């Protein structure tokens, strides 16, 4: 029942318009379990015109964690010392297993460290569990959508 907490949070950073409409459907399709060919929605993201590199990074991060079994996302997630806090946070998320446990800790750090922390996990999608990674996405999305 936590999959909806990722949905609404991701739909908070995407700029309003005819793009939040397209992304909305593509999300609630893989969140129902029909799409399998991972490298289709990946390409679909990369070519979309009103998406910031950061949004393409988070969306690409979420899609990968779903689908059963890229450089344009790594270069979006990863510029001063925010990497320094990310490395230590990354070493902590290994300890945590549940979604809410990591989200509680990740929400306590800067928005810069979180987005870069996601870059660390993308290199190893097996180092940490999925529930935690969602918690990182949820904490990341909220803090960057908390500026205004």
Numbering used by the authors: 2 to 70, 77 to 85, 89 to 158
Passage from the reporting paper:
As the most abundant viral protein encoded by the M gene segment, matrix protein 1 (M1) forms a shell underneath a host cell-derived lipid biolayer to connect the vRNPs with the viral envelope in mature virions. The full-length M1 protein includes 252 amino acids consisting of a highly organized N-terminal domain and a flexible but less ordered C-terminal domain that are linked by a protease-sensitive loop. So far, only the N-terminal domain of M1 has been structurally resolved at an atomic level, showing that at neutral pH the physiological monomers have a high tendency to oligomerize via a so-called ‘face-to-back’ arrangement, whereas at acidic pH the N-terminal domain exists as a dimeric structure in a so-called ‘face-to-face’ arrangement.
G88R but not G88E was originally acquired by the virus as a spontaneous compensatory mutation after NLS disruption. M(NLS-88R) M1, similar to wt-M1, is able to switch from a face-to-back monomer–monomer association at neutral pH to a face-to-face-oriented dimeric conformation at acidic pH. The residues Lys104 (part of the NLS motif), Arg134, Tyr100 and Asp94 on the ‘face’ of one molecule (Monomer A) interact with several complementary residues on the ‘back’ of a second molecule (Monomer B), including Glu29, Asp30, Lys21 and Ser17. The face-to-back monomeric arrangement of M1 occurring at neutral pH is likely necessary for the formation and maintenance of a confluent and strong matrix layer underneath the viral envelope, whereas the face-to-face dimeric arrangement at acidic pH may describe M1 that has dissociated from the extended matrix layer. We then determined M1–M1 interactions under different pH conditions by BLI. Regardless of pH conditions, M(NLS-88R) had M1–M1 interactions in a dose-dependent manner similar to wt-M1. Nevertheless, M(NLS-88R) M1 retains pH-dependent conformational transition like WSN. Compared with M(NLS-88E), that M(NLS-88R) has less difficulty to break the fulcrum likely translates into a smaller cooperative energy requirement of monomer-to-dimer conversion under subtle pH changes. This flexibility facilitates M(NLS-88R) M1 to dissociate from vRNP in the acidified endosome, thus prompting virus replication in vitro. Our results also indicate that the compensatory G88R mutation was not a random mutation but was chosen by the virus purposefully to retain pH-dependent conformational flexibility for efficient virus replication.
